[PDB]
């Protein structure tokens, strides 16, 4: 594995620092490393493919070296080199892809392909170098084991969930009380509604609460919290809980009262914010709890009073809400987010080559399904597969 | 740094009899030399010597680095290898004069 | 061109690895490269500027080299160096800017300025090095020919378009059926409305469809698809198609039925998703097709039944919608996105120096106009101009 | 300070470039630098902590160098090294944290801790090197005196502000005219409402305006401007200005007329856009001014005419709005944004160790409070503290 | 830049210490320094001007040295010298002026002109000398970044502002209550008026307050505070707030009651004085708050009682006031004051040569406009430009 | 007292006439004066503060003199100097302030502080100069 990495920063820090011009000196420490490789290789036959629509190109090795008898690289030097790199490029591609599909329950955290199982071999370790690519940096630290970690802009921690819970309902659905929400990606929107506008509620206040349990702990999260749930601020016709009929939601929005957001870790409050909208920090949590209330306005102008009668029919439905977005955070486990192409790379290679569904990943690498049942096996396979995708993107995008 | 090295250099090259080398030449020769890398071999070794340099110097039998003056009836220390002696592997708290 | 690049990583990897203290050994391979430059230079004279409100500063060179002596940098060494760099800095700026404005129809993909036309010269090539800056990495590969590629967050592929199409309308605009949308940047929101709530429609279902054709193919796209179009979920007074009057839209939202998203490439379905909300991957496409339906609720509580009468007036307008956002994707062509400052840099330099409108780019480098008619000439000029902006940002932000 | 930096890229470019195998010569230039350090250190004792729940761990030095002999590193070489790095890791952490809390009103820009005050010492500067980490790159240029500059995404320039201004109101709040808005982070949404639909207004047009003054200038901003303010497009019951009662807002949305956005700098218009929605560039500004109008529709279908009577009661409230989002921008001052973890790191370390509120930063490092009164002292302390957080994240995430 | 300085103290300490008489030895240390210069120069070529009505002049060098021979100085020695100085005089003038007009947004700090950009060159640094000129003394310390400082008599910190605020008013403007003031330069005069003489006010006392926010902190300020605002002690006919009409102010003055002056820094009270008139010290502040009251006289002789009836018309308007003048203070930023000619020099050179308005400074170098929006760029440019003016005044007044 | 004065015009006519560029000889008469000081100092220790919110920092001395590397100064010369001046600056401040608070009815026209009472000492007078302030 670590092997694999080098093979690339080798080529990038190569196809990049080797051009018509420069002084040798820039590459002395480089050229060397390079050659070392060629040697170890030459003579070993490699096989890739043998699944779905994946060609089976075979590769032989018999390549010359790189004279160090020069100062300024003459064009002629480049071309006689690029021609030798373009075999490694078109190679690695066919290598990544091959181990970017196979899955294993028992040892999923390990290598699979007849291509890689041979790389972890000892006689090859003679290469490894310059491990500063965020992902490998983290692969290693995970095998000796310690405080690993990554960076994500608008991460993808919430499996898609869009539903409601009626705490008070009746067949006609003309006087409901409950909450409706949308948890997806890095965002949560939740609204609490009370058709009666807390007319018969103690202190004329109806309490609401929304709890979201993350499948992985997020640390160092920068979060935007805003009052109101725009998504649930418009008229809707919704299916009843049993699917037998449809109800009408005609919201009128009031400010959420006594807003309290708690970021908990193992049941303990790590961060708590009372009615603080804007940017807040949640430093370590596996659960978010949003509590908010609808308080019947004690003073109402005629126009307002008219919306909230003492008796049914209740035609304007009092609604309070919150919107929470995790802009950035760190997670000890790999996740999809709004900037990295890893998930898309893995999913794309599998789709393009018609790779059959395996025993670990959900059909189509479906994110919601994956994060909903993010087992240790899925995570180890995901990390292996994401790390390979990142190695590949250093050369092929 | 000047001549010294240059002289030997040319000599070993055989071909020319130094002397009749305009003084503008020998020095100019240095000016150019003092701008190149160094056979990894050569270089790689010097780096080595420097790192240990310190260690050798104090590690010798005859010769040590400087002495301190306190004019303060001071307590002699004791170290297995020398017995009752007045060393001190640490000068800190008193000016230093190269 | 490639020339230009070096001139920078030269300075950055310079103004960065050179400070009061450090051992020579961290720069031996560096110092060298540097000097090499100085030589090639001094002796040659330069001219930059002219066009628009841009000063014309003339530059001469003849700077002494360095020292390979001290194997432990003394402050005095730095200052005598920084003073020589600050002429190259204030130089390059005036260089980038000069070729960051000239455009050319015929062969407007190569160098233009009297400054650069002289750089591509052969006697200069003796510099090129460390091409690891994502953009140059891609410039080269394009020169030779190969699968290039860049990375973008919330890419800017959709020219702004906000409109509607009335499939059924009449003068009074009291019983309309059609769609309205907003395509902008990386997002699409589309709503299908039927004032009659499919009362006389076959199977009481009204079909809708929204097709968006990208001007460039996007690959490896991570996309968020959510039901509902919040933007079209509120009451509106809109201008009629002919601009002669205004109509009233009073939406009530129902869940979109039989949602099907197709990502097509040259007319072929590459990815298709049926009613899958949340995160989905579209691996290669030039067109997005969103199909969704409004199905009249077969069972309605009184409150719902009241919104949908058997006869006009239709006062509550049944609406179904979708929201699609491209979080990240790869494109073989340069594009503006939500993170990179390239477009803003180019646009800003042109605005600051009152650069006259040219023959290639739309007035003000207007993104919508540019992407709407993204001709080969505009793309080649944009790439040249974006690559220069990226070279400049390594030193001047 | 600069000292501190090195200590890290030292370790990263270390714990990264040293793996079982690699041919020596990839590190010769590296090993050296390393050792140099060890020397300078050994013999000097250090002290950290001493506040809140911050342990007072003590440290000492006395370590063997690193055999620069071998040609290919053997496993045994690594382990005898990693064991020496893990003391520097666990060290630096305790170092960063210590100076990542202390604050000073006067010279709150310089070093404070008994740990760092000793680092700026001269005998230590024998270490500095490879200052390519975006943040240090900028620290220096600032200490030297020049145009700094940082890169962002959905930056956090607007302190949270959600309010309204009634330009025409009366006790019953049945015929209001004014604006309501939400400024937060990188986004602004503003709506102008006129209950009378400009029935008695000159030219049947009501003018609106929203001005936002940034606490710091933003340059090279890529901005999305869209018509409509979805946040203010739904029915609301709002508290009156004096808090004595509640009013009803029942919006119906019309297109904003004569939209003009001005990005001003010191009172001067730098960029102006007339009705241009989509992506626009604002190259240098400290103020944004959004002007827009509500124009009573000159021609109305019956359904529309019915919403806007000649006499009260006014039951449908004409509303026009705008949404503006700063996707990316450059600022000469550090700021929180949607991608960087700096603010979250600083805030998190302080929260975890129960660090008492100090004299500079608002309680909890509250962003809104900080940006609202972004004094020079808060900025210097923030930059110091953000730069340290970035040094720490190179090793510990 | 520092270069520039020397060029002068060179000449002054020259055209001053060199005349028909004196012994050599009192200038030996001087002569030397001088010559050194000549050398560095000779051969080098210059250019100045080329902007607006500014003459473009070219200069060359080729001069003799000095007879370090003679014991005394014979007349003949002088003349052969003065003739060589008068070329440097008439030179420097044309040099200062050239860089005393150019402005720049990005690096508004550094040099601009083709004359100076060449001076900061390294080969010229061989000239610095005697920097006891208050301004250079401060220029340097600012590069090294440290607590600078200047000395000012009647400083110019308050942008001109002359207005009023009516806290109680009515159409007839026959019973007003509010304040009127004049903030200008180093002075503030503010009056609080109550047409009713607090007849219906709690405790028959009307409270007033005037807050002035400085654009820069002033330290070590010697201030004169006196009761009464003579400027607002006479009858006036004033324009109404809306400009639609004019009101009558007919003051009668009473002693200000419970006078409290607070000099605040970042919201904190640094100095507070209760009813202390005369000379007071404000050691560090960015805000001044003046609070004072009008207390209806509890005992009134007939003549007084007659001015203050229980019912309108109120014909004599009770007024209380304060006058505050900052005699001297120190500021870390350059400012105009009542003694220094810097602002006038810069403004005068620009006016005389018809220099076009630039991107940094307000038209005409208008002080009020400048101090009102005293941006970092304006301050850096102002300091550069003020320092040059001070260098010039050492030789040319 | 007069002592005190010098300590400054020393530094000003110093932090001013000493820049990356001037020829040595333009400061020969200056360098000298300077060193002379250093000598007299090093060794003797001082206390400042000890009143209200005034910090009590202890100042000790230990400094090497000044080179001369002919033909205008090299940057390296400056820095190794500025670093030695910045201890005298931050010092004097703490010195002035200490005797700028104590008062005395009887003989309150003379030195009061444990800092200055030691300066008027004789072994120090060897400094005074350029009294044009
Ligand atoms: Zn984003």
What is A308-329 written as a DSSP string? S-SSS---SEEEEEEEEEEEEE
C-beta separation of D188 from D287 below 8 A? no
CB neighbour list of residue A293: distance below 8 Å, 6 or more residues apart: A192, A205, A206, A207, A208, A256, A257, A258, A320
CB proximity F83 to C under 8 Å: no
The nearest alpha carbon in chain E to D141 belongs to E143
Query: For residue E161, which of E184, E180, E190 has the smallest C-alpha distance?
Result: E184
| D317 annotated as belonging to a binding site for a ligand | no
DSSP sequence for D321-343: EEEEEEEEEEESS----SS--HH
Residue A110 corresponds to which tokens in the numbers above?
Answer: 């390990």
The alpha carbon of A251 and the centre of ligand 1 are apart by a number of angstroms equal to 29
User: What is the phi/psi pair of residue E216, to 5°?
Assistant: -145, 150
Query: For residue D94, which of D37, D42, D59, D48 has the smallest C-alpha distance?
Result: D48
Residue A202 corresponds to which tokens in the numbers above?
Answer: 């103690």
Going through D36-153 in order, the beta strands assigned E by DSSP cover 46-47, 58-59, 150-151
Whole-angstrom CA distances from A349 to A92, A336, A353, C271, D178 are 14, 16, 6, 13, 55
C-beta separation of E218 from E326 below 8 A? yes
Query: For residue D91, which of D139, D44, D29, D27 has the smallest C-alpha distance?
Result: D44
DSSP 8-state secondary structure symbol assigned to residue A205: E
User: What is the phi/psi pair of residue E259, to 5°?
Assistant: -70, 130
Beta bridge partners of A21: A73
Of C144, C277, C281, the CB nearest to A344: C281
Q: How many of the other CB atoms lie within 10 Å of CB of A89?
A: 16
Enumerate neighbours of D (3 or more CB pairs within 8 A).
A, B, C, E
- The H or E element spanning position A371 is helix A367-372
Beta bridge partners of D330: D151, D219
∠ CA(A123), CA(A127), CA(A131), 5° rounding? 135
Query: Helix-strand-coil percent breakdown of chain B, rounded to 5?
Result: 40, 5, 55
Strands C54-59 and A72-73: unpaired
Whether residue D313 has a cis bond before it, omega within 30° of 0: yes
Determine the Cα–Cα distance for residues F91 and F99; give it in Å rounded to an integer.
13
Chains F and A touching, counted as 3 or more CB pairs less than 8 Å apart = no
Q: How far apart are the first and last CA of chain A?
A: 21
Q: Which residues of A touch B40 (CB under 8 A)?
A: 28
Largest distance between two CA atoms of chain B: 69
Secondary structure (3-state) at C345: helix
Determine the Cα–Cα distance for residues A267 and D343; give it in Å rounded to an integer.
25
Question: Residue A216, Cα to own-chain centre: how many angstroms?
Answer: 11
Q: Which residues of D touch A40 (CB under 8 A)?
A: none
Strands A251-253 and A317-331: parallel
Determine the Cα–Cα distance for residues A320 and A191; give it in Å rounded to an integer.
6
Strands D268-274 and C251-253: unpaired
CB proximity E143 to D under 8 Å: yes
CB neighbour list of residue D392: distance below 8 Å, 6 or more residues apart: D8, D92, D93, D96, D100, D345
C-beta separation of A47 from A56 below 8 A? yes
Determine the Cα–Cα distance for residues E148 and E144; give it in Å rounded to an integer.
10
Chains E and B touching, counted as 3 or more CB pairs less than 8 Å apart = no
C-beta separation of A335 from A151 below 8 A? no
Whole-angstrom CA distances from E301 to C227, E305, E318, E320 are 82, 6, 16, 19
- The H or E element spanning position E212 is strand E205-227
CB proximity A220 to D under 8 Å: yes
C-beta separation of C232 from C226 below 8 A? no
Residue B56 corresponds to which tokens in the numbers above?
Answer: 């050798």
Determine the Cα–Cα distance for residues E179 and E162; give it in Å rounded to an integer.
11
The nearest alpha carbon in chain A to B38 belongs to A25
- Tell me the residue length of chain B: 98
H helices, E strands: number in chain F = 3, 2
CB proximity C276 to D under 8 Å: no
The alpha carbon of D367 and the centre of ligand 1 are apart by a number of angstroms equal to 19
Helix axes C134-144, C2-15, angle to 10 degrees: 160
Determine the Cα–Cα distance for residues A188 and A254; give it in Å rounded to an integer.
19
Determine the Cα–Cα distance for residues F84 and E227; give it in Å rounded to an integer.
51
Query: For residue E27, which of E14, E38, E37 has the smallest C-alpha distance?
Result: E14
C-beta separation of A182 from A189 below 8 A? yes
C-beta separation of C247 from C240 below 8 A? yes
Task: Test D28 with B90 for CB contact under 8 angstroms.
Answer: no
Q: Which residues of B touch C37 (CB under 8 A)?
A: none
Domains of chain C (ranges; CATH) run 1-158+329-397 (1.10.1350.10), 159-328 (2.60.120.170)
Beta bridge partners of C218: C285, C331
Whole-angstrom CA distances from A316 to A197, D193, D248, D307 are 9, 21, 12, 19
Query: For residue C146, which of A56, A342, A85 has the smallest C-alpha distance?
Result: A85
Residue C138 corresponds to which tokens in the numbers above?
Answer: 């891609």
User: What is the phi/psi pair of residue C271, to 5°?
Assistant: -135, 140
CB proximity C176 to D under 8 Å: no
Mutation test of the interface with chain F: which of C19, C75, C78, choosing the one with the most F Cβ atoms within 10 A?
Answer: C75
Exposed, middle or buried, A311 (CB in 10 Å: 0-12/13-18/19+)? exposed
Residue B16 corresponds to which tokens in the numbers above?
Answer: 């020319």
Residue A351 corresponds to which tokens in the numbers above?
Answer: 């789709």
The nearest alpha carbon in chain E to F23 belongs to E33
Whole-angstrom CA distances from E191 to D92, E238, E245, E277 are 60, 15, 22, 16
DSSP 8-state secondary structure symbol assigned to residue D255: P
CB proximity B37 to A under 8 Å: yes
DSSP sequence for A346-365: HHHHHHHTTPPP-SSSPGGG
C-beta separation of A330 from A151 below 8 A? yes
Determine the Cα–Cα distance for residues D23 and D293; give it in Å rounded to an integer.
70
Of C127, C234, C301, the CB nearest to A246: C301
DSSP 8-state secondary structure symbol assigned to residue A26: H
Determine the Cα–Cα distance for residues C244 and D133; give it in Å rounded to an integer.
59
DSSP 8-state secondary structure symbol assigned to residue E202: G
Query: For residue A348, which of C213, C156, C330, C212 has the smallest C-alpha distance?
Result: C330
C-beta separation of C1 from C388 below 8 A? no
Whole-angstrom CA distances from C260 to A250, A344, C210, C293 are 28, 20, 11, 10
Determine the Cα–Cα distance for residues C337 and D279; give it in Å rounded to an integer.
10
Task: Test D128 with C19 for CB contact under 8 angstroms.
Answer: yes
Tell the residue number behind the tokens 């970021």, with chain if given. Answer: A263
User: What is the phi/psi pair of residue A28, to 5°?
Assistant: -50, -55
C-beta separation of E328 from E376 below 8 A? no
């Amino acid at each position: 594995m670590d092997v694999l990495y080098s093979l690339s920063k080798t080529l990038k820090d190569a196809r990049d620092k080797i051009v018509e011009g420069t002084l040798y000196s820039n590459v002395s420490d480089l050229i060397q490393q390079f050659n070392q490789m060629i040697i170890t290789m030459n003579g070993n036959e490699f096989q890739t493919g043998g699944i779905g629509n994946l060609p089976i190109r075979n590769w032989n090795f018999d390549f010359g070296l790189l004279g160090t008898t020069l100062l300024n690289l003459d064009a002629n030097y480049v071309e006689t080199a690029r021609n030798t790199i373009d075999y490694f490029v078109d190679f690695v591609d066919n290598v990544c892809m091959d181990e970017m599909v196979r899955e294993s329950q028992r040892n999923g955290i390990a290598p699979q392909s007849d291509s890689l199982r041979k790389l972890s071999g000892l006689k090859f370790k003679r290469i490894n170098f310059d491990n500063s690519s965020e992902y490998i940096e983290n692969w290693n630290l995970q095998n000796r084991r310690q405080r690993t970690g990554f960076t994500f802009h608008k991460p993808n921690i919430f499996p898609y969930s869009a539903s409601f819970t009626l705490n008070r309902s009746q067949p006609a659905h003309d006087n409901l009380m409950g909450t409706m929400w949308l948890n997806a990606g890095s965002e949560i929107q939740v609204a609490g509604f009370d058709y009666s506008c807390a007319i018969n509620a103690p202190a004329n206040t109806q309490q609401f609460e929304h709890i979201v349990q993350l499948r992985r702990v997020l640390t160092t999260a920068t979060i935007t919290l805003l009052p109101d749930a725009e998504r649930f601020s418009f008229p809707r016709v919704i299916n009843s809980a049993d699917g037998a009929t449809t109800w009408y939601f005609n919201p009128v929005i009031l400010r959420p009262n006594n807003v309290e957001v708690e970021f908990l870790l193992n049941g303990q409050i790590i961060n708590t914010y009372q009615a603080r909208f804007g940017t807040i920090i949640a430093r370590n949590f596996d659960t978010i709890r949003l509590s908010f209330q609808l308080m019947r306005p004690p003073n109402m102008t005629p126009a307002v009073a008219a919306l909230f009668p003492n008796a049914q029919p209740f035609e304007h439905h009092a609604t309070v809400g919150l919107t929470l977005r995790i802009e950035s955070a760190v997670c000890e486990s790999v996740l999809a987010d709004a900037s990295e192409t890893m998930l898309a790379n893995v999913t794309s290679v599998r789709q393009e080559y018609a790779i059959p569904v395996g025993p670990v990943f959900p059909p189509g690498m479906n994110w919601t399904d994956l994060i909903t049942n993010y087992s240790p096996s899925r995570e180890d396979n995901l990390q292996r597969v994401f790390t390979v995708a990142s190695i590949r993107s250093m050369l092929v995008k | 740094k000047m001549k010294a090295i240059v002289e030997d250099f040319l000599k070993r090259l055989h071909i020319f009899d130094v002397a009749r080398v305009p003084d503008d030449q020998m020095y100019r020769l240095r000016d150019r030399l003092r701008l190149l890398p160094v056979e990894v071999r050569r270089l790689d070794i010097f780096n080595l010597i420097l790192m240990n340099m310190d260690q050798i110097e104090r590690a010798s039998d005859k010769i040590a680095q400087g002495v301190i003056i306190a004019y303060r009836d001071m307590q002699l220390e004791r170290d297995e290898m020398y017995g009752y002696v007045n060393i001190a592997r640490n000068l800190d708290g008193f000016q230093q004069i190269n």
